[PDB]
Each structure stands twice: as C-alpha cells, then as structure tokens.
Design a protein around this ligand. Structure first.
Ligand SMILES: CN(C)CC(=O)Nc1ccc2[nH]c(=O)c3ccccc3c2c1
Ligand SMILES: [Zn+2]
Length: 199
C-alpha cells in the first residue's frame, strides 16, 4: 500500500502538456516496473537536520511535501544527494533544484532539459521501450515565496526557504517548487517505469 500509494500519485498527476509531448513523449499513463525506497542514512540525517532548522524558522512547521524530480543524474542523487552546486542561473527561477507535483512534468526532464535527445539507445524523447527513472522526494519548502513570473535567483528570497512557481496566463501551465540548498530534499523513492503508447 506504500508502493501502491506512490504508484497512484504517479498515475493520477499526469497531465496533458502544452508542448504535445515534445519533451517527455506522448502518453496518458505509465507502466510502473519497480518502486524502491532509498535508505541512505547519511543523506536522511542531512535532510532531517535541515528540516528541524527550517521548521524553527517557520513557526514550528517544515512545510514538507512529497514531489517528483526527473533528471539524468538520478543515480548520483541517490548516493550523494541533491547538490545545488550543479544548479546554474536559468530556468524560470534561477539556480535552484526543481520539483513538480505532476509526475508528467518531471518526466520532461528525465533525459535532459526539454527531454534532451531522448533515450541513449534510440535517441527518442517518446521512447516506449527504454525504462525511465523518476524520484519521488520529500522536500522541505519552509516559508515558500510565491511567484508567477521568471525571477532568476541565486538563493532563496530573503526570509524564505524555497520558491513556489504558480500557474499564470503568460507563464506556467503547472506548478513547480524550487529549493536552493541540496539538503532540503531527500530522494525517498526511486521509480522505474515506461511511458505507455496511448490507446
Ligand atoms: C534552471 N536551471 C537550474 C536548469 C535546470 O536545472 N533545469 C531542470 C532540471 C531538472 C528538473 N526536474 C524536474 O523534475 C523539474 C520539475 C519542475 C520544473 C523544472 C524541473 C527541472 C528543471
Ligand atoms: Zn529507447
């Protein structure tokens, strides 16, 4: 039921994307192959230490969410953790680590920015054959700065612990959540999956 619950969040948060599947491929659901809980104690403690500190700075409230992350560097993330040193100015919200509440938004990043050239084997952003990996993560948002338009930050806004990108007419289709310190997320579940050709 733990893994079922993860599988339900993955399927149910899929959305139709404005790019027509260009980045992440064309699909309405996934084939979920495997869900593994990552047990990296050094990383868990880094995470909970920071979460305690953020909660102190936010009226005894971590504001933690479970959110998706797609990247080509999933296997480094599970061993070494998220690392803001690999983030550069860019994106809507600058040099942060980005997360989605819609699994299909994160899927757009699994093979690179805008999907890169897709899977290594077939160079196909809509590959139905190769197995993809997404993380489903605990993220400490603390006091989160709501923003609609591009604001390329190096760090959290003063007094804040994250940025939440809200949907807006000339802006985002879907929400996105941005942290500027690697220790504010833990890669809790590693999900191995395929996108499924539509019916
Ligand atoms: C913005 N620069 C720090 C480049 C960059 O890291 N892009 C990037 C890289 C990986 C990303 N992965 C996500 O799951 C995601 C989810 C919602 C919105 C953005 C992303 C996402 C974005
Ligand atoms: Zn492939």
């Amino acid at each position: 039921k733990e893994f079922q619950s993860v599988e339900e969040e993955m399927q149910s948060t899929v959305r139709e994307h404005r790019d027509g599947g260009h980045a992440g491929g064309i699909f309405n659901r996934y084939n979920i192959l495997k869900i593994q809980k990552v047990c990296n104690k050094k990383l868990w403690e880094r995470y909970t230490h920071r979460r305690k500190e953020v909660s102190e700075e936010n009226h005894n409230h971590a504001n933690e969410r479970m959110l998706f992350h797609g990247s080509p560097f999933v296997n480094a993330i599970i061993h070494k953790g998220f690392d803001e040193r690999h983030a550069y100015i860019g994106g809507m919200f600058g040099a942060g680590i980005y997360f989605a509440e819609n699994s299909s938004k994160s899927n757009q990043y699994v093979y690179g920015i805008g999907g890169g050239t897709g899977c290594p084997v077939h160079k196909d952003r809509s590959c139905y054959i190769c197995h993809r990996q997404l993380l489903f993560c605990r993220v400490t948002l603390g006091k989160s700065f709501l923003q609609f338009s591009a604001m390329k930050m190096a760090h959290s806004p003063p007094g804040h612990h994250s940025v939440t990108g809200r949907p807006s007419v000339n802006g985002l289709a879907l929400a996105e959540y941005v942290i500027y310190r690697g220790e504010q997320a833990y890669p809790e579940y590693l999900i191995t999956y395929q996108i499924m050709r539509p019916e």
